[PDB]
Design an enzyme around this catalytic site. Structure first.
Site, PDB file in Angstrom:
ATOM      1  N   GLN B 108       0.815  -1.203   0.000  1.00 28.30           N
ATOM      2  CA  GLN B 108       0.000   0.000   0.000  1.00 28.30           C
ATOM      3  C   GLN B 108       0.854   1.261   0.000  1.00 28.30           C
ATOM      4  O   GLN B 108       1.101   1.861   1.044  1.00 28.30           O
ATOM      5  CB  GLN B 108      -0.944  -0.026   1.197  1.00 28.30           C
ATOM      6  CG  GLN B 108      -0.249  -0.343   2.518  1.00 28.30           C
ATOM      7  CD  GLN B 108      -1.100  -1.222   3.443  1.00 28.30           C
ATOM      8  OE1 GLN B 108      -0.565  -2.061   4.179  1.00 28.30           O
ATOM      9  NE2 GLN B 108      -2.424  -1.033   3.411  1.00 28.30           N
ATOM     10  N   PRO B 109       1.295   1.691  -1.188  1.00 27.93           N
ATOM     11  CA  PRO B 109       2.125   2.883  -1.353  1.00 27.93           C
ATOM     12  C   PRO B 109       1.402   4.225  -1.215  1.00 27.93           C
ATOM     13  O   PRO B 109       2.049   5.271  -1.270  1.00 27.93           O
ATOM     14  CB  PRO B 109       2.707   2.695  -2.748  1.00 27.93           C
ATOM     15  CG  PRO B 109       1.637   1.974  -3.464  1.00 27.93           C
ATOM     16  CD  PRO B 109       1.151   0.966  -2.461  1.00 27.93           C
ATOM     17  N   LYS B 110       0.070   4.210  -1.128  1.00 28.47           N
ATOM     18  CA  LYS B 110      -0.694   5.445  -0.956  1.00 28.47           C
ATOM     19  C   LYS B 110      -1.111   5.550   0.490  1.00 28.47           C
ATOM     20  O   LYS B 110      -2.275   5.404   0.837  1.00 28.47           O
ATOM     21  CB  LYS B 110      -1.905   5.478  -1.876  1.00 28.47           C
ATOM     22  CG  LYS B 110      -1.515   5.753  -3.310  1.00 28.47           C
ATOM     23  CD  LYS B 110      -2.709   5.983  -4.202  1.00 28.47           C
ATOM     24  CE  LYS B 110      -2.223   6.430  -5.564  1.00 28.47           C
ATOM     25  NZ  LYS B 110      -3.342   6.713  -6.490  1.00 28.47           N
ATOM     26  N   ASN B 111      -0.135   5.814   1.338  1.00 23.17           N
ATOM     27  CA  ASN B 111      -0.379   5.905   2.761  1.00 23.17           C
ATOM     28  C   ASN B 111       0.687   6.851   3.293  1.00 23.17           C
ATOM     29  O   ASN B 111       1.843   6.785   2.877  1.00 23.17           O
ATOM     30  CB  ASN B 111      -0.248   4.496   3.362  1.00 23.17           C
ATOM     31  CG  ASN B 111      -0.242   4.486   4.874  1.00 23.17           C
ATOM     32  OD1 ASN B 111       0.512   5.221   5.512  1.00 23.17           O
ATOM     33  ND2 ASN B 111      -1.047   3.611   5.462  1.00 23.17           N
TER      34      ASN B 111
END
Ligand SMILES: CC[C@H](C)[C@@H](CO[C@@H](Cc1ccccc1)C(=O)N[C@@H](CCS(C)(=O)=O)C(=O)O)NC[C@@H](N)CS
Ligand SMILES: CC(C)=CCC/C(C)=C/CC/C(C)=C/COP(=O)(O)OP(=O)(O)O
Ligand SMILES: OC[C@H]1O[C@@](CO)(O[C@H]2O[C@H](CO)[C@@H](O)[C@H](O)[C@H]2O)[C@@H](O)[C@@H]1O
Ligand SMILES: [Zn+2]
Lengths: 410, 313
Positions: B108-111
């Site tokens: 989960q790179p959108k954190n």
């Protein structure tokens, strides 16, 4: 004119086809993604046209209201990912009901108040849920929710002495703020701090020392504002930056000219909605983050006596934005969304409606001018461009807290 | 030890090594609002996290417990913070944690929390050796991940890793010349290395951008970069640029070119140019064309520019 049961739409004009992407015969992931979205949007636009018969657009109020009312009490475990964002759920839902002019039953109002009290840390600020550490974002959300409620019971839940101390504990020497203790730093914190501080009357001379200058450093070559100096211009950060500067009365620190040209370019010629940054996709929540910058820029320019400012319109296509939101961002079952094919959620419901309200209402001085596309019932309650809660709620809240002293100062 | 979805996973309330400590249930108040109906596993983990946090127990069991809390909700910043507090107390091997955060970011790179935790690790280790490669991989999955680019600018700046970033920019612009995050990095690299005051650097940049425009006339990013690298000095200060853009007029016209022409006229008028009447008239015509035909979505903005030009010149 035309019959009252038929209203011509900008997106449905024949010339509008010329607004489709022109990839110059050079495909890249960017042009490809854009083309897919446009393709879908075209189908949607078409479904509202019946040759020369174009029925008035309708905002599904009841369906949204039932969706909001249901979410304010309970949620599925699909909402486990928002366990550290509960005051946001309160704010998204209450502000949405507020824009729709649906009242908050006093039992629910009090219950919400009590919940936010449980989220408030003993050190100041509000955590994302009972027992979680304070974080500027849910603190911002909680203060706004309390203000939307407007009762003294709500106003009083805010422990102001600790709130100020808390902000201080996050203040960096360079003018920025941490989002939380041991947390990241970006322009969102500046806005969160400036919002709660001004609303609750806890601003000291030194609190925001250096902040305006730090924010200006975030304005980049594009004209927009990035998360931190050097980073790409993004609507979310630009809204945070400009709104913060407006609260601090330091808008002039920015090159307002290049900011204006940048934000106006973020409106999609075909879709009508806004994108977050250049060469990315349209999204309904930017209806607020991007479009909301126009009322702010207007106020800033009017302040410095700009004689060319319009007296009846925001510098963006109000009609096109409303068409995009009404035709492409409504979930049949209630709630609003990013773009066709996306699942609805409270965040988008909140921002699509906020943007719709801004696209509908213009005001500068004693100058008012509405543009309510579709059935008259579509008209929403106005929203404050800086705080994004009703203007009445802002005055009422700031008036209340102005009757109190700044914690331990003067 | 045992993952949350592993077949032999056991709830914390059933683990013997946790029996000595009582769980702390979350108190939502008598009448709950925005109340999430948590899965039994989720609640179970958080009831124990609440208990260790409350007791400020700096234990190894608490440390492993945070890993599960993070899988259940990687956006829980309180868990991440306490975990960093444990890395310090327990003096855990940071290279191990680097491997963990590398795995997490990948899923989960959108954190916001995960990228910050990585930055804290890199600062603690003062070791940036893995950054450009790791980020390049994430960017390989999403060439525009905001956090990725932000973390990248940070590491390059903090550890002076400027040497290969412009080649990286060029490669990614080759892959997608419409990648605005890349054009942004280009500005970042150049302004922080040679700067744009060196006329040789400026010309190279102007030529490169113009080439890109000619290949993809409707790519907005290149047009924005072109104005971006010239706006500070003033667009009217580059007299050859006007003529070159006018040449592209029929064979490459687009709202972007026409808009750029207005910007040039704007600056010219602002700088005591000759033919003020002529330039004003040319500029007003273009504003009208953009408002009525070529860029109607920005009608209000173009009309406004037309009015500004008239009140000023
Ligand atoms: C990682 C989050 C993403 C970058 C998100 C923007 O998240 C912002 C806005 C937001 C705020 C509250 C809830 C959800 C979103 C952001 O501030 N994200 C913070 C919120 C922290 S908290 C604890 O107040 O919930 C985050 O850490 O994700 N981007 C969204 C665009 N794709 C448009 S939908
Ligand atoms: C007060 C407050 C907390 C405001 C937050 C404003 C906001 C929405 C910021 C966005 C931050 C961000 C890194 C977006 C990129 O995500 P993305 O790549 O998924 O989105 P994109 O493609 O639209 O740019
Ligand atoms: O939009 C450009 C505008 O922003 C300012 C800051 O308010 O500077 C930004 O852009 C420059 C490029 O034009 C960069 O050199 C600078 O680092 C960035 O902050 C203004 O100077 C400029 O006019
Ligand atoms: Zn969105």
């Amino acid at each position: 004119s035309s019959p009252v049961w038929s209203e011509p739409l900008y997106s449905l004009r024949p010339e509008h086809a010329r607004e489709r992407l022109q990839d110059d015969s050079v495909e890249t992931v960017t042009s490809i993604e854009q083309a897919k979205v446009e393709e879908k949007i075209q189908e949607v636009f078409s479904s509202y046209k019946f040759n020369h018969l174009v029925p008035r657009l309708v905002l599904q109020r009841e369906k949204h209201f039932h969706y909001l009312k249901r979410g304010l009490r309970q949620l599925t475990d699909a909402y486990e990912c928002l366990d550290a964002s509960r005051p946001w759920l309160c704010y998204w839902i209450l502000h949405s009901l507020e824009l729709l002019d649906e009242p908050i039953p006093q039992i629910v109002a009090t219950d919400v108040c009590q919940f936010l009290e449980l989220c408030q840390s003993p050190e100041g600020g509000f955590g994302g849920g009972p027992g979680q550490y304070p974080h500027l974002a849910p603190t911002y959300a909680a203060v706004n929710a309390l203000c939307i409620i407007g009762t003294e019971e709500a106003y009083d839940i805010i422990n102001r002495e600790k709130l100020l101390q808390y902000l201080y504990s996050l203040k960096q020497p360079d003018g920025s703020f941490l989002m939380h203790v041991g947390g990241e730093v970006d322009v969102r914190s500046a806005y969160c701090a400036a919002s709660v501080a001004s609303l609750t009357n806890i601003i000291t001379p030194d609190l925001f020392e250096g902040t305006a200058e730090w924010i200006a450093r975030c304005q980049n070559w594009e004209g927009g504002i990035g998360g931190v100096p050097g980073m790409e211009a993004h609507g979310g950060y630009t809204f945070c930056g400009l709104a913060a500067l407006v609260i601090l009365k330091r808008e002039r620190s920015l090159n307002l000219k290049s900011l204006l040209q940048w934000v106006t370019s973020r409106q999609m010629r075909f879709e009508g909605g806004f994108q977050g940054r250049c060469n990315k996709l349209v999204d309904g929540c930017y209806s607020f983050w991007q479009a909301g910058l126009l009322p702010l820029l207007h106020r800033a320019l009017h302040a410095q006596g700009d004689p060319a400012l319009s007296m009846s319109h925001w510098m963006f296509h109000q009609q096109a934005l409303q068409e995009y939101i009404l035709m492409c961002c409504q979930c049949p079952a209630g709630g609003l969304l990013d773009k066709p094919g996306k699942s609805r959620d409270f965040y988008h419901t909140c921002y699509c409606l906020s943007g719709l309200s801004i696209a509908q209402h213009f005001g500068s001085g004693a100058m008012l001018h509405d543009v309510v596309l579709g059935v008259p019932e579509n008209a929403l309650q106005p929203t404050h461009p800086v705080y994004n809660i009703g203007p009445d709620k802002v005055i009422q809240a700031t008036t209340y807290f102005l009757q109190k002293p700044v914690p331990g100062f003067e | 030890f045992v993952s949350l979805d592993s077949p032999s996973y056991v709830l914390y309330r059933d683990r013997a090594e946790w029996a000595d400590i009582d769980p702390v249930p979350q108190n939502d108040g008598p009448n709950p609002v925005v109340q999430i109906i948590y899965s039994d596993k989720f609640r179970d983990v958080y009831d124990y996290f609440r208990a260790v946090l409350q007791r400020d127990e700096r234990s190894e069991r608490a440390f492993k417990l945070t890993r599960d809390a993070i899988e259940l909700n990687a956006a829980n910043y309180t868990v991440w913070h306490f975990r960093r507090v444990l890395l310090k107390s327990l003096q855990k091997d940071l290279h191990e944690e680097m491997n963990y955060i590398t795995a997490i970011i990948e899923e989960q790179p959108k954190n916001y929390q995960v990228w910050h935790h990585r930055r804290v690790l890199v600062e603690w280790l003062r070791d940036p050796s893995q950054e450009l490669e790791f980020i390049a991989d994430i960017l390989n999955q999403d060439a525009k991940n905001y956090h990725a680019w932000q973390h990248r600018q940070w590491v390059i700046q903090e550890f002076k890793l400027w040497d290969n970033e412009l080649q990286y920019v060029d490669q990614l612009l080759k892959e997608d010349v419409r990648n605005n995050s890349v054009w942004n990095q280009r500005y970042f690299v150049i302004s922080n290395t040679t700067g744009y005051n060196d006329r040789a650097v400026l010309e190279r940049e102007v030529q490169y951008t113009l080439e890109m425009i000619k290949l993809v006339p409707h790519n907005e990013s290149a047009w924005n970069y072109l104005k971006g690298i010239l706006q500070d000095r003033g667009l009217s200060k580059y007299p050859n640029l006007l003529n070159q853009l006018l040449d592209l007029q029929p064979s490459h016209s687009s709202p972007y070119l026409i808009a750029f022409l207005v910007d040039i006229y704007e600056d010219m008028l602002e700088n005591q140019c000759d033919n003020k009447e002529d330039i004003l008239n040319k500029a007003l015509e273009l504003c009208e064309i953009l408002a009525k035909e070529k860029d109607t979505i920005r009608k209000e903005y173009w009309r406004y520019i037309g009015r500004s030009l008239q009140s000023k010149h």
